[PDB]
């Protein structure tokens, strides 16, 4: 398949990304608590449902939530201010809460079943969100870094296999703050560092210029 792109909602961020986040890729956004990673996830879950002329892929979404941070009412707001019907947008987001890191890993295998079901339809899965990818692994493997890295490596490999095999954009969030971080090392296809700037602006930089945007009723925008 050709590489598809999903607009982030921000022209600035899209330019930094060469058009948007890519299918057949894992995009990892990392930064401190409150930097806006989950807002970017919510925005992408709407944008992907637009036609390509507006920066989407007419795609369906699968969302794995590890922190109970998915907000359907926020999806509705973004959809309504992106000219889409909010009920339709929500009907095309499959949502699951991961109870722990082992359940999170099983949910990726389950996602493949729905991906296959939708593959030949007019609304194939085009976006798989894992928010937060690292939170359960970090809390469960305190004092056991070597074992944590083994499990994370397999999880990321599963996500790669889905991105490439089914032409999906995988978008993952990772909280990194004071003294923290192996990030995801070199595993993601693309690492985006997100931070707060003056006056509520958000600033993004590729790790391995900078885009600037705001969180609004449209999700994010310049």
Ligand X SMILES: Oc1cc2ccccc2cc1O
Burial class (CB in 10 A: 0-12, 13-18, 19+), 79: buried
CB of 66 to ligand X, least distance (A): 11
Cα 65 from chain centre: 11
CB of 221 to ligand X, least distance (A): 27
Helices (H), the chain: 11-16, 37-47, 72-80, 86-91, 101-118, 135-140, 145-166
Residue 64 vs 204, nearer CB to ligand X: 64
Is residue 105 a contact residue for ligand X (CB under 6 A)?
Answer: no
Is residue 94 a contact residue for ligand X (CB under 6 A)?
Answer: yes
Is residue 61 a contact residue for ligand X (CB under 6 A)?
Answer: no
Taking CB under 6 A as the criterion, the residue among 19, 95, 158, 164 binding ligand X is: 95
Instruction: Choose one: 29-37, 60-68, 167-175, 201-209; the region binding ligand X (CB under 6 A).
Output: 60-68
Taking CB under 6 A as the criterion, the residue among 19, 69, 103, 114 binding ligand X is: 114
Is residue 107 a contact residue for ligand X (CB under 6 A)?
Answer: yes
CB of 193 to ligand X, least distance (A): 26
Specify the long-range contacts of residues 142-151, CB closer than 8 Å, at least 24 apart. 149/182, 151/101, 151/105
Instruction: Choose one: 109-117, 146-154, 165-173, 179-187; the region binding ligand X (CB under 6 A).
Output: 109-117
**Inter-residue contact 22 to 3 (CB < 8 Å):** yes
Taking CB under 6 A as the criterion, the residue among 25, 64, 75, 188 binding ligand X is: 64
Taking CB under 6 A as the criterion, the residue among 40, 48, 62, 133 binding ligand X is: 62
- In 3D space, the residue among 46, 8, 27 whose CA is nearest the CA of residue 173 turns out to be 27
Phi, psi of 97 (to 5 degrees): -100, 125
Residue 156 vs 194, nearer CB to ligand X: 156
Q: For the chain, state the CA radius of gyration.
A: 16
**Inter-residue contact 173 to 130 (CB < 8 Å):** yes
- In 3D space, the residue among 142, 164, 132, 159 whose CA is nearest the CA of residue 4 turns out to be 164
Residue 94 vs 212, nearer CB to ligand X: 94
**Inter-residue contact 7 to 20 (CB < 8 Å):** yes
CB of 190 to ligand X, least distance (A): 22
Instruction: Choose one: 17-25, 39-47, 58-66, 148-156; the region binding ligand X (CB under 6 A).
Output: 58-66
Residues that bind ligand X (CB under 6 A): 62-64, 94-96, 107, 110-111, 114
């Amino acid at each position: 398949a050709t590489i598809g792109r999903i607009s982030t909602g921000s022209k600035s961020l899209d330019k930094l990304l060469g058009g948007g986040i890519e299918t057949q890729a894992i995009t990892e956004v990392f930064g401190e608590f409150g930097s806006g990673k989950t807002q970017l996830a919510h925005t992408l879950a709407v944008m992907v449902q637009l036609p390509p002329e507006e920066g989407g892929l007419n795609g369906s979404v699968m969302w794995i939530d590890t922190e109970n941070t998915f907000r359907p009412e926020r999806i509705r707001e973004i959809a309504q201010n992106r000219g889409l019907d909010p009920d339709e947008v929500l009907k095309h987001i499959a949502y699951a809460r991961a109870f722990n890191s082992n359940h999170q890993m099983l949910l990726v295998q389950q996602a493949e079943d729905m991906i296959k079901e939708l593959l030949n339809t007019d609304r194939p899965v085009k976006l798989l969100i894992v928010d937060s990818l690292t939170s359960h692994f970090r809390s469960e493997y305190i004092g056991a870094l070597a074992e944590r890295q083994q499990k994370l490596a397999k999880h990321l490999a599963d996500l790669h296999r889905l991105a490439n095999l089914y032409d999906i954009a995988v978008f993952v969030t990772n909280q990194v703050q004071a003294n923290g971080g192996h990030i995801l090392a070199h595993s993601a296809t693309l690492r985006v560092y997100l931070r707060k700037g003056k006056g509520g602006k958000r600033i993004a930089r590729l790790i391995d210029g900078e885009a600037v945007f705001s969180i609004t009723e449209k999700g994010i925008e310049d």
